Amino acid sequence: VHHQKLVFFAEDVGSNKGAIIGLMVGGVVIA
Amino acid sequence: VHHQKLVFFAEDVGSNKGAIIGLMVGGVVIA
Amino acid sequence: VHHQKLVFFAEDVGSNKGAIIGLMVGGVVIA
Amino acid sequence: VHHQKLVFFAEDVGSNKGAIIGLMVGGVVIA
Amino acid sequence: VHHQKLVFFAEDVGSNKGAIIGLMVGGVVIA
Amino acid sequence: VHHQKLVFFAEDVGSNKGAIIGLMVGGVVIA
Amino acid sequence: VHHQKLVFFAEDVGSNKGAIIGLMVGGVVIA
Amino acid sequence: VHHQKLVFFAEDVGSNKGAIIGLMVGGVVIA
Numbered sequence: 517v518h519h520q521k522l523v524f525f526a527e528d529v530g531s532n533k534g535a536i537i538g539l540m541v542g543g544v545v546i547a
Numbered sequence: 548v549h550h551q552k553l554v555f556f557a558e559d560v561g562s563n564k565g566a567i568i569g570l571m572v573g574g575v576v577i578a
Numbered sequence: 579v580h581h582q583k584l585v586f587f588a589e590d591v592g593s594n595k596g597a598i599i600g601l602m603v604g605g606v607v608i609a
Numbered sequence: 610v611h612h613q614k615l616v617f618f619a620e621d622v623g624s625n626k627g628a629i630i631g632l633m634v635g636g637v638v639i640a
Numbered sequence: 641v642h643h644q645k646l647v648f649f650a651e652d653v654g655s656n657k658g659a660i661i662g663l664m665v666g667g668v669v670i671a
Numbered sequence: 672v673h674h675q676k677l678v679f680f681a682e683d684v685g686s687n688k689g690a691i692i693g694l695m696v697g698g699v700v701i702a
Numbered sequence: 703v704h705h706q707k708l709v710f711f712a713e714d715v716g717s718n719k720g721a722i723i724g725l726m727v728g729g730v731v732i733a
Numbered sequence: 734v735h736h737q738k739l740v741f742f743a744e745d746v747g748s749n750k751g752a753i754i755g756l757m758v759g760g761v762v763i764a
Contacts, residue, residue: 517548517549517573517604518549518550519549519550520552521552522551522552522553522554522572523552523553523554523555523557524555524556524567525555525556525557525559525563525565525596526555526556526557526558526559527557527558527559528558528559528561528563529560529561530560530561530562531562531563532562532563532564532565533564533565533732533763534564534565534763535566535567535568535762535763536565536567536568536570537568537569537724537726537755538568538569538570538723538724538754538755539569540569540570540571540572540723540754541571541572541573542572542573543571543572543573543575544574544575544576545575545576545577545690545721545752546576546577546688546719546720546721546750547575547577547578548580548604549580549581550580550581551582551583551584553582553583553584553585553603553634554583554584554585554586554588555586555598556586556587556588556590556594556596556627557585557586557587557588557589558588558589558590559589559590559591559594560591561591561593562592562593562594563593563594563595564595564596564701564732564763565595565596565732565763566596566597566598566599566700566731566732566762567596567597567598567599567601568599568600568693568695568724568726569599569600569692569693569723569724569725570601570693571600571601571602571603571723572603572604573603573604574602574603574604574605574606575605575606575607576659576690576721577607577608577688577689577690577719578606578608578609579610579611579635580611580612581611581612582613582614582615583614584613584614584616584634585614585615585617585619586617586618586627587617587618587619587621587625587627588616588617588618588619588620588621589619590620590622590623590625591622591623592622592623592624593623593625594624594625594626595626595627595701595732596626596627596701596732597627597628597629597700597701597731598627598630598632599630599631599662599664599693599695600630600631600661600662600692600693601631601632601662601693602631602632602633602634602661602692603633603634603635604634604635605635605636605637606636606637606638607638607639607659607690608638608657608658608659608688609637609639609640626670627670628669628670628700628701630662630664631661631663631693632662633661638659641672642672642673642674643673643674643675644677645675645676645677645678646675646678647677647678647681648678648679648680648681649679649680649681650678650680650681650682651681651682651683652680652681652682652683653683654683654685654686655685655686655687656680656683656686656687657687657688657689658680658687658688658689658690658691658711659690659691660679660690660691661690661691661692661693662692662693662694662695663691663693663694663695664695664698665695665697665708666672666698666703667698667699668698668699668702669699669700669701670700670701671702672703673703673704673705674704674705674706675706676706676707676708677706677709678712679710679711679712680710680711680712681709681711681712682712682713682714683711683712683713683714684714684716685714685715685716686716686717686718687711687714687717687718688718688719688720689711689719689720689721689722689742690721691710691721691722692723692724693723693724693725693726694722694724694725694726695726695727695729696708696727696729696739697703697727697729697734698729699731700730700731700732701731701733702733703734704734704735704736705735705737706737707737707738707739707740708737708739709740709743710740710741710742710743711742711743712742712743712744713743713744713745714742714743714744714745715745715746716745716746716747717747717748717749718742718745718748718749719749719750719751720749720750720752720753721752721753722741722752723752723753723754723755724754724755724756724757725753725755725757726758726760727739727757727758727759727760728734728758728759728760729761730760730761730764731761731762731763732764733764
């Protein structure tokens with residue numbers, strides 16, 4: 517929270533392919 | 548919260564393909 | 579909240595394709 | 610709140626395609 | 641389209657908590 | 672499309688907690 | 703499409719907890 | 734597509750806990 521960049525598919529040159537599914541970092545669920 | 552960039556699909560040159568599904572960072576649910 | 583950029587699909591040159599589904603950062607639900 | 614840019618589909622040159630669904634940052638619901 | 645029910649949070653008894661984010665079924669975007 | 676029920680959090684009795692993020696079935700994007 | 707039920711958190715009795723992240727069935731993206 | 738049930742956390746009695754992350758069946762991405 518103090519400092520976060522969070523950057524995806526940035527500064528891409530040429531042909532780029534990919535995909536992101538799910539992926540969870542930290543956080544609290546079901547308390 | 549202090550400093551966040553949060554940038555996606557920025558400064559893209561040429562052909563770029565991709566997709567983002569779900570993906571959760573931090574946060575609180577079901578308290 | 580202090581400083582946020584929040585920029586998507588900006589400064590795009592050429593052909594760019596993509597999609598964003600869901601994606602949650604921080605926040606509070608169900609208190 | 611102090612400083613926010615919030616910019617989407619800006620400064621786009623050429624052909625650009627994409628879509629945003631949901632996506633929630635911060636905020637408080639159901640108190 | 642022929643027959644759809646589409647019912648959420650219906651016939652609820654007692655204490656129920658939950659949330660729905662995104663979620664897309666069918667449909668056509670970016671043609 | 673011919674026949675769809677699509678029912679969530681229905682007929683709930685007692686205490687129930689949960690959450691749904693993303694989740695995509697079928698559909699066409701980026702054509 | 704011919705016949706779909708699609709039912710979640712239905713007919714729940716007592717205490718139930720859980721969460722769904724991502725999860726994709728079928729569909730076409732990036733054409 | 735011809736016939737799908739797709740049912741999760743249904744007909745639950747008593748105390749039930751669990752979580753689903755990712756999980757992909759079929760579908761086509763990056764064409």
